[PDB]
Design an enzyme around this catalytic site. Structure first.
Site, mmCIF file in Angstrom:
data_model
loop_
_atom_site.group_PDB
_atom_site.id
_atom_site.type_symbol
_atom_site.label_atom_id
_atom_site.label_comp_id
_atom_site.label_asym_id
_atom_site.label_seq_id
_atom_site.Cartn_x
_atom_site.Cartn_y
_atom_site.Cartn_z
ATOM 1 N N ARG A 185 0.854 -1.220 0.000
ATOM 2 C CA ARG A 185 0.000 0.000 0.000
ATOM 3 C C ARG A 185 0.876 1.251 0.000
ATOM 4 O O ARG A 185 2.004 1.188 0.516
ATOM 5 C CB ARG A 185 -0.953 0.033 1.199
ATOM 6 C CG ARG A 185 -2.282 -0.669 0.959
ATOM 7 C CD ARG A 185 -3.186 -0.001 -0.070
ATOM 8 N NE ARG A 185 -4.260 -0.910 -0.460
ATOM 9 C CZ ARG A 185 -4.147 -1.908 -1.343
ATOM 10 N NH1 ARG A 185 -3.000 -2.143 -1.964
ATOM 11 N NH2 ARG A 185 -5.192 -2.680 -1.598
ATOM 12 N N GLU A 214 -2.314 8.316 -5.970
ATOM 13 C CA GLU A 214 -2.230 7.480 -7.198
ATOM 14 C C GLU A 214 -3.162 8.023 -8.283
ATOM 15 O O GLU A 214 -4.383 7.929 -8.160
ATOM 16 C CB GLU A 214 -2.530 6.029 -6.835
ATOM 17 C CG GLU A 214 -1.432 5.400 -5.995
ATOM 18 C CD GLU A 214 -1.587 3.910 -5.770
ATOM 19 O OE1 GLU A 214 -0.643 3.291 -5.262
ATOM 20 O OE2 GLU A 214 -2.654 3.377 -6.114
ATOM 21 N N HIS A 232 0.792 0.450 -10.078
ATOM 22 C CA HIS A 232 0.002 -0.425 -9.171
ATOM 23 C C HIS A 232 -0.412 -1.693 -9.924
ATOM 24 O O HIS A 232 -1.630 -1.935 -10.053
ATOM 25 C CB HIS A 232 -1.188 0.364 -8.587
ATOM 26 C CG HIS A 232 -1.690 -0.172 -7.288
ATOM 27 N ND1 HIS A 232 -1.897 0.639 -6.187
ATOM 28 C CD2 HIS A 232 -2.007 -1.428 -6.904
ATOM 29 C CE1 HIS A 232 -2.338 -0.093 -5.182
ATOM 30 N NE2 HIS A 232 -2.413 -1.369 -5.598
HETATM 31 N N1 LIG Z 1 0.555 -4.377 -5.127
HETATM 32 C C1 LIG Z 1 -0.697 -4.754 -5.357
HETATM 33 O O1 LIG Z 1 -1.270 -4.572 -6.430
HETATM 34 C C2 LIG Z 1 -1.433 -5.460 -4.251
HETATM 35 C C3 LIG Z 1 -2.415 -6.420 -4.488
HETATM 36 C C4 LIG Z 1 -2.701 -7.335 -3.503
HETATM 37 C C5 LIG Z 1 -2.134 -7.170 -2.260
HETATM 38 N N2 LIG Z 1 -1.489 -6.013 -1.935
HETATM 39 C C6 LIG Z 1 -1.207 -5.647 -0.513
HETATM 40 O O2 LIG Z 1 -0.285 -6.558 0.054
HETATM 41 C C7 LIG Z 1 -0.407 -6.502 1.493
HETATM 42 C C8 LIG Z 1 -0.343 -7.893 2.078
HETATM 43 O O3 LIG Z 1 -1.248 -8.791 1.372
HETATM 44 P P1 LIG Z 1 -1.359 -10.282 1.960
HETATM 45 O O4 LIG Z 1 -2.417 -11.044 1.231
HETATM 46 O O5 LIG Z 1 0.002 -10.895 2.076
HETATM 47 O O6 LIG Z 1 -1.891 -9.931 3.430
HETATM 48 P P2 LIG Z 1 -2.359 -10.812 4.681
HETATM 49 O O7 LIG Z 1 -3.584 -10.167 5.244
HETATM 50 O O8 LIG Z 1 -2.428 -12.240 4.259
HETATM 51 O O9 LIG Z 1 -1.132 -10.626 5.692
HETATM 52 C C9 LIG Z 1 -0.896 -9.374 6.387
HETATM 53 C C10 LIG Z 1 0.182 -9.607 7.418
HETATM 54 O O10 LIG Z 1 0.757 -8.346 7.860
HETATM 55 C C11 LIG Z 1 1.038 -8.479 9.232
HETATM 56 N N3 LIG Z 1 1.268 -7.176 9.849
HETATM 57 C C12 LIG Z 1 0.339 -6.210 10.142
HETATM 58 N N4 LIG Z 1 0.856 -5.148 10.708
HETATM 59 C C13 LIG Z 1 2.210 -5.428 10.804
HETATM 60 C C14 LIG Z 1 3.299 -4.693 11.317
HETATM 61 N N5 LIG Z 1 3.194 -3.481 11.855
HETATM 62 N N6 LIG Z 1 4.523 -5.266 11.252
HETATM 63 C C15 LIG Z 1 4.628 -6.482 10.704
HETATM 64 N N7 LIG Z 1 3.680 -7.266 10.200
HETATM 65 C C16 LIG Z 1 2.475 -6.675 10.276
HETATM 66 C C17 LIG Z 1 -0.170 -9.235 9.764
HETATM 67 O O11 LIG Z 1 0.065 -9.730 11.060
HETATM 68 C C18 LIG Z 1 -0.279 -10.328 8.696
HETATM 69 O O12 LIG Z 1 0.564 -11.439 8.968
HETATM 70 C C19 LIG Z 1 -1.699 -5.718 1.768
HETATM 71 O O13 LIG Z 1 -1.366 -4.402 2.189
HETATM 72 C C20 LIG Z 1 -2.408 -5.773 0.409
HETATM 73 O O14 LIG Z 1 -3.329 -4.726 0.162
HETATM 74 C C21 LIG Z 1 -1.112 -5.157 -2.940
#
Ligand SMILES: NC(=O)c1ccc[n+]([C@@H]2O[C@H](COP(=O)([O-])OP(=O)(O)OC[C@H]3O[C@@H](n4cnc5c(N)ncnc54)[C@H](O)[C@@H]3O)[C@@H](O)[C@H]2O)c1
Ligand SMILES: NC(=O)c1ccc[n+]([C@@H]2O[C@H](COP(=O)([O-])OP(=O)(O)OC[C@H]3O[C@@H](n4cnc5c(N)ncnc54)[C@H](O)[C@@H]3O)[C@@H](O)[C@H]2O)c1
Lengths: 254, 242
Positions: A185, A214, A232
């Site tokens: 994000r 964005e 993105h």
């Molecule tokens: N780039 C893109 O186009 C795109 C698309 C999909 C996912 N994403 C983003 O990727 C990220 C992760 O996706 P995911 O499916 O792996 O998520 P998920 O929900 O499976 O995992 C999130 C993890 O982050 C951990 N976390 C939260 N706060 C934390 C902190 N302060 N320090 C360390 N760890 C922390 C949680 O405990 C959890 O293990 C999200 O922000 C999601 O929106 C971006």
């Protein structure tokens, strides 16, 4: 009863089971005035698992791109230049990758770059060390992480506790010329902080798929030679949009 | 006899017609793979680039960064591929070819290949399925060449190769210029038989001809396969020992 797909796998699963006469609505990429709803991506509902690998493949890509400057070498060659010395790069084997948030994408990233001989250390407030040790990530606190890392990558949701997870305090503890990736994000890396790190050499490169705004208004990062970026694209594959289109429609029947 | 280092090398080395013109000359010392060489000096660095090239092709990373750098936000235009479940052809299964294989296997890629003097059972050991070249071409989403430059390997990808390939086969060459027939590859790129190519190396370095570097679906580097601090260091010692 009746649903619009504002925005083919979805239409089929939903039928098998201008929003004036609609019970539901579906999108991919809904203002207060506009207001069950569903997002094809990561009572409102979404498809958390769908973009996991495709976002994780981009990240590994950013990592190798930052290591060998592929997108800046391409633009050099396309300007007719043959710039050997300039693009002297870094070998990944034996380097230490730091991974923030080890949810769906963290472990996919971690295992993949383990194949390249990257030592994978990590941190996550909910995911246990027993779980992280099962996909080769030694969990330590953030203060033991910074001075070990050659690369750092972020796969946390956007919260106040992650808003500015990498700022000046964090850059100050990192190894000189740390490289950094944000495929999660806009805002988890403080953009203010990443410029200063870049400007002093503290940050050696940066790969951004995401921005606090964005498209980003301030172009200081995008235009910086040691910054590679995408609009993105983490969730932009035919595979991902197929899987997110289903995952959403399967639920709407549930 | 003293030693002379013409090209740009790593300090460690020093501390630790042309052939015809030199009567004192006994040994030419090459820092790389390409008489003495550094066979496993820069295999990893090269493998690591090849793997990056595949990644850049899959998701148009170089192009996307150019697009952003031209003050553009165009999501639609940069629709990319997922490597998971795709098939990567590996022609030549030596030092580099197997290191490429195990790295990309980790992205859940099917690794098929060809190497004459490597048996199917040995390639099996590092996860690569050898089949006859005819059976290879139609199965491949992605092709990577890791052969020496030889007569037989000159145009190893040619018009007959692309004939048998999937519509939209993306190709990578971090070995040598000519192994992929440049003329062939352009025709394939023009007909969209080859969705895209990624090139570290050229028949002429730098190339005079700009058709391939200019093509929208091509990505390039000026021979950066051996261009890591670590690789030049190892090679430097690895020849200064010899
Ligand atoms: N780039 C893109 O186009 C795109 C698309 C999909 C996912 N994403 C983003 O990727 C990220 C992760 O996706 P995911 O499916 O792996 O998520 P998920 O929900 O499976 O995992 C999130 C993890 O982050 C951990 N976390 C939260 N706060 C934390 C902190 N302060 N320090 C360390 N760890 C922390 C949680 O405990 C959890 O293990 C999200 O922000 C999601 O929106 C971006
Ligand atoms: N881009 C760079 O900067 C860079 C750096 C390192 C090496 N290279 C080049 O990459 C190539 C591969 O190097 P390597 O370390 O794997 O060498 P290697 O000799 O260990 O492996 C090459 C293999 O290809 C096999 N082969 C021979 N003819 C073949 C054919 N017709 N079809 C398929 N396989 C065939 C050989 O038997 C050998 O096993 C070399 O040409 C080398 O010069 C490029």
């Amino acid at each position: 009863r009746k649903v619009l797909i504002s925005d083919p796998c979805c239409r089929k699963i939903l039928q098998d089971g201008e929003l004036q006469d609609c019970e539901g609505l579906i999108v991919r990429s809904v203002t207060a005035d506009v207001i069950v709803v569903g997002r094809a991506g990561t009572l409102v509902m979404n498809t958390p698992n769908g973009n996991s690998l495709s976002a994780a493949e981009l990240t590994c890509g950013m990592i190798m791109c930052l290591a060998r400057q592929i997108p800046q070498a391409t633009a050099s060659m396309k300007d007719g230049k043959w710039e050997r010395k300039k693009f002297m790069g870094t070998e990944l084997n034996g380097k230490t990758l730091g991974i923030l948030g080890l949810g769906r994408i963290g472990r996919e990233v971690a295992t993949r770059m383990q194949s390249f001989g990257m030592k994978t250390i990590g941190y996550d407030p909910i995911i246990s060390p027993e779980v992280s040790a099962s996909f080769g990530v030694q969990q330590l606190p953030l203060e033991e992480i910074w001075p070990l890392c050659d690369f750092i990558t972020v796969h946390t949701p956007l919260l106040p506790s992650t808003t500015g997870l990498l700022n000046d305090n964090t850059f100050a503890q990192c190894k000189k010329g740390v490289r950094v990736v944000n495929c999660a994000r806009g805002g988890i890396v403080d953009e203010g902080a990443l410029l200063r790190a870049l400007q002093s050499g503290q940050c050696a490169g940066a790969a951004l798929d995401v921005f606090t705004e964005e498209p980003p208004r301030d172009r200081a990062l995008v235009d910086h030679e040691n910054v590679i970026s995408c609009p993105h694209l983490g969730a932009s594959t035919k595979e991902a949009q197929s899987r997110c289109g289903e995952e959403i429609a399967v639920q709407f029947v549930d």
